[PDB]
Amino acid sequence: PPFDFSTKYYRQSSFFGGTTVLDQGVGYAVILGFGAFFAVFTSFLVKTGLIASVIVSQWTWAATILQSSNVAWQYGVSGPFWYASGATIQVLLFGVMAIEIKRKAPNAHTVCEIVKARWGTATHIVFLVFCLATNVVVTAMLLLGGSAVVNALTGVNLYAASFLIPLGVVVYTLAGGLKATFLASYVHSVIVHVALVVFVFLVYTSSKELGSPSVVYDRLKDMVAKSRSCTEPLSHHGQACGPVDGNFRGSYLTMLSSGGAVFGLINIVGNFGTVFVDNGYWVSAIAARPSSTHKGYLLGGLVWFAVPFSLATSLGLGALALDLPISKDEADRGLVPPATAIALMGKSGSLLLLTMLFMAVTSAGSSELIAVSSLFTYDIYRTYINPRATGRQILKISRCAVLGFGCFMGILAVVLNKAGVSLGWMYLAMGVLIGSAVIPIAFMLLWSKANAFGAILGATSGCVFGIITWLTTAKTQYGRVDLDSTGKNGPMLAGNLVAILTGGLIHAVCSLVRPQNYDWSTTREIKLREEKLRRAKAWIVKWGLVFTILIVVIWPVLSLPARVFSRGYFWFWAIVAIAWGTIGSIVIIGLPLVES
């Protein structure tokens, strides 16, 4: 027993594996009786302070809670920062796109409806597949994290919980109409900003094991020790015993991390492909009013930064200090937060984490069910199958396109849990697959010299050129090609960078040769005023760029001279983390109540 505080663990090969905390009755009632319960609850109840809450609501997926801590268990303190740093980029790209949607195409319901107008019907069917693949990739990795936490904490069979989760979201979507309400989007941002405060104040303030920022420091300095022998009876391969490979001096408390720095690039490339190629973002930008409220997107983006930052800094750095025997596979599957929650407050932190996770799963898997349904009913039914009917049919074949997707996703989730895919491989592989269609979409709304064949070729060749590099680098640097060598940070960076850049270069070189000068006169008709929509854009591209350059660039640069953090500097980091996540938890729960 190397340490006196972790002696009941002596070393195991995994934290989980037997004697589940909860019983199957609790697990079979949460995956099936949460969407229905909230559907009845919302029907029981009949500004720039209510736009921030709705903005925060749809941006919280099941990966925000589970992967931010996965990249904090490795790399130390650079993980949560590099994960959360992609926050002002989204707000800038959402504002500057919601302005142009209102200015150049007011009567559209889907992104692929502005594609058939600008360009032809041959570049429509390519992006109609490149958009339907993103709704599959994102929906398939909140059924991978949801079905692993439930099986771990409770004991429900994972193949039987992968098929019952989508059916609890289909009921929630069908009930309450296939539309969003400002009342149901306010109760979702209240529950997730209460568990955040509870978990942050339990780790650095109150717990009888990890109680102060000066205990985490002394316990994270002892894990990375050069005199710690952990060959075969005192650790295993991927169990995080000693010095970190790639960190300055092997320390967890440093911002000089290379593995954590390349994940920032991967995260940036991956997050650009979900605000452009995902129709769920276009649906929620069409239904906004930038002219009336546009300062509510910055306040709804500066508060979301504290959710993956504070919670990860607590729940991922409190697992290293407690010496839990978490293996690498379990950490990948999304099992660090439930590992810390049982260790700190067992049988009661596990019910709080389940509620916080399934309040995000059910509220983010309903935004994809109404994004695939619209992309079907408005684009493959009333464009090509039957364009002469609009009465009572548009609704039937919109309600019937949710049930089909909720079953296809359920079957595909069963198929990918048998194989062995884990959020953590799908999260990193998103860019390699759908990054080639990002710039051909920005050029559609922002550039007046972009043609159709260039878009087709740039979208359809970048994917192949990215996958070839992604599968080649792993083969030439690791021997074989399987789920292990492919998920490394080497191949994935090459794949992401090739995919995003080649599809932009090919499209922007082939368009300066044969330009199509477009006045947007065809997208403006599909089915004062300009002064406000010109000052709003001026405000956004200034006050979003300032914060982007201030957070992504200046803040990490000034932390490099700190080298290994010293007691007193970690007290500053661990206090910024608590302050952001506390003063962000009042402006969401009390500001949209100063309506009075």
Ligand X SMILES: CC(C)CCC[C@@H](C)[C@H]1CC[C@H]2[C@@H]3CC=C4C[C@@H](OC(=O)CCC(=O)O)CC[C@]4(C)[C@H]3CC[C@]12C
Ligand Y SMILES: CCCCCCCCCCCCCCCC
- Going 237 to 354 to 431 to 580, the CA torsion angle's sign is negative
Nearer to ligand Y by C-beta: 248 or 543?
A: 248
Pick from ligand X, ligand Y, none: which does 264 bind, CB < 5 to 8 A by kind? ligand X
Q: Does 259 bind ligand Y (CB under 6 A)?
A: no
Pick from ligand Y, ligand X, none: which does 76 bind, CB < 5 to 8 A by kind? none
Residues from 228 through 257 that contact ligand Y (CB under 6 A): 248-249, 256
Pick from ligand X, ligand Y, none: which does 320 bind, CB < 5 to 8 A by kind? none
Distance, in Å, from the CA atom of 103 to the CA atom of 520, rounded to the nearest integer, reads 10
Q: Does 265 bind ligand Y (CB under 6 A)?
A: no
What is the full DSSP assignment across 208-259?
SSS-SHHHHHHHHHHHS-TT---SSSS--TTS--S--TTBGGG-SSBS-BSH
Q: Does 6 bind ligand Y (CB under 6 A)?
A: no
Q: Does 501 bind ligand X (CB under 6 A)?
A: yes
Pick from ligand Y, ligand X, none: which does 324 bind, CB < 5 to 8 A by kind? none
Pick from ligand X, ligand Y, none: which does 552 bind, CB < 5 to 8 A by kind? ligand X
Pick from ligand X, ligand Y, none: which does 541 bind, CB < 5 to 8 A by kind? none
Q: Does 258 bind ligand Y (CB under 6 A)?
A: yes
- Which stretch, 55-63, 121-129, 182-190, 484-492, contacts ligand X (CB under 6 A)? 484-492
Measured from the CB of residue 275, what is the shortest distance to ligand X in angstroms? 17
Measured from the CB of residue 478, what is the shortest distance to ligand X in angstroms? 7
The correct pick among 360, 493, 536, 574 for binding ligand X (CB under 6 A) is 493
Q: Does 464 bind ligand X (CB under 6 A)?
A: no
Nearer to ligand X by C-beta: 340 or 496?
A: 496
Pick from ligand X, ligand Y, none: which does 125 bind, CB < 5 to 8 A by kind? none
Backbone φ, ψ for residue 114 (5° rounding): -85, -10
Distance, in Å, from the CA atom of 544 to the CA atom of 345, rounded to the nearest integer, reads 40
Q: Does 489 bind ligand Y (CB under 6 A)?
A: no
Residues from 557 through 586 that contact ligand Y (CB under 6 A): 557
What is the full DSSP assignment across 127-151?
HHHHHHHHHHHHHHTTHHHHHHHHH
Residues from 171 through 230 that contact ligand X (CB under 6 A): none
Measured from the CB of residue 550, what is the shortest distance to ligand X in angstroms? 13
CB 75, CB 247: distance < 8 Å: yes
Q: Does 548 bind ligand Y (CB under 6 A)?
A: no
Q: Does 490 bind ligand Y (CB under 6 A)?
A: no
Q: Which of 168, 188, 150 is nearest to 33 (CA)?
A: 168
Three-state DSSP class for 106? coil
CB 297, CB 91: distance < 8 Å: yes
Distance, in Å, from the CA atom of 361 to the CA atom of 43, rounded to the nearest integer, reads 20
The correct pick among 261, 414, 481, 526 for binding ligand Y (CB under 6 A) is 261
Nearer to ligand X by C-beta: 137 or 498?
A: 498
Measured from the CB of residue 267, what is the shortest distance to ligand Y in angstroms? 14
Measured from the CB of residue 216, what is the shortest distance to ligand X in angstroms? 24
Q: What number of chain residues touch ligand Y (CB under 6 A)?
A: 7
Measured from the CB of residue 550, what is the shortest distance to ligand Y in angstroms? 14
Residues from 242 through 271 that contact ligand X (CB under 6 A): 258, 261-262, 264-265, 268
Q: Name residue 254's beta-bridge partners.
A: 564
Q: Which of 436, 429, 339, 405 is nearest to 166 (CA)?
A: 405
Quick count: other Cβ atoms within 10 Å of Cβ 550?
Answer: 11
Angle at 9 between CA 202 and CA 331, to 5 degrees: 65
User: What residue has token string 């960190």?
Assistant: 247
Q: Does 560 bind ligand X (CB under 6 A)?
A: yes
Q: What number of chain residues touch ligand X (CB under 6 A)?
A: 22
CA distances from 408 to 47, 126, 135, 403, 405 (A): 40, 21, 12, 9, 5
Nearer to ligand Y by C-beta: 249 or 289?
A: 249
The correct pick among 561, 594, 595, 596 for binding ligand X (CB under 6 A) is 561
Distance, in Å, from the CA atom of 54 to the CA atom of 186, rounded to the nearest integer, reads 7
Q: Show the tokens assigned to 300.
A: 């709804």
Q: Show the tokens assigned to 389.
A: 């009917």
Measured from the CB of residue 564, what is the shortest distance to ligand X in angstroms? 10
Pick from ligand X, ligand Y, none: which does 494 bind, CB < 5 to 8 A by kind? ligand X
Secondary-structure percent of the chain, ordered helix, strand, coil, rounded to 5: 65, 0, 35
Measured from the CB of residue 259, what is the shortest distance to ligand X in angstroms? 8
Q: How far is CA 255 from the centre of its chain?
A: 23
Task: Say what the alpha-carbon torsion angle 428, 111, 411, 482 is, to the nearest 10 degrees.
Answer: -20
Nearer to ligand X by C-beta: 176 or 301?
A: 301
User: What residue has token string 């296939």?
Assistant: 178
Measured from the CB of residue 58, what is the shortest distance to ligand X in angstroms? 24
Name the residue with the smallest CB distance to ligand X. Answer: 490
Q: Does 488 bind ligand X (CB under 6 A)?
A: yes
- Give the end-to-end CA distance of the chain in Å, rounded to a whole number: 59
**Residue 477 corresponds to which amino acid?**
Q
The correct pick among 144, 171, 371, 498 for binding ligand X (CB under 6 A) is 498
Residues from 413 through 432 that contact ligand X (CB under 6 A): none
Task: Say what the alpha-carbon torsion angle 535, 536, 537, 540 is, to the nearest 10 degrees.
Answer: 120
Pick from ligand Y, ligand X, none: which does 194 bind, CB < 5 to 8 A by kind? none
For residue 432, with 0-12 CB atoms within 10 Å meaning exposed, 13-18 middle and 19 or more buried, which class applies? buried
Q: Name residue 247's beta-bridge partners.
A: 257
Pick from ligand Y, ligand X, none: which does 175 bind, CB < 5 to 8 A by kind? none
Three-state DSSP class for 564? strand
Residues lying near ligand Y in the complex (CB under 6 A) are found at 248-249, 256, 258, 261, 556-557
Binding site for ligand X (CB under 6 A): 258, 261-262, 264-265, 268, 473, 477, 488-490, 493-494, 497-498, 501-502, 505, 552, 557, 560-561
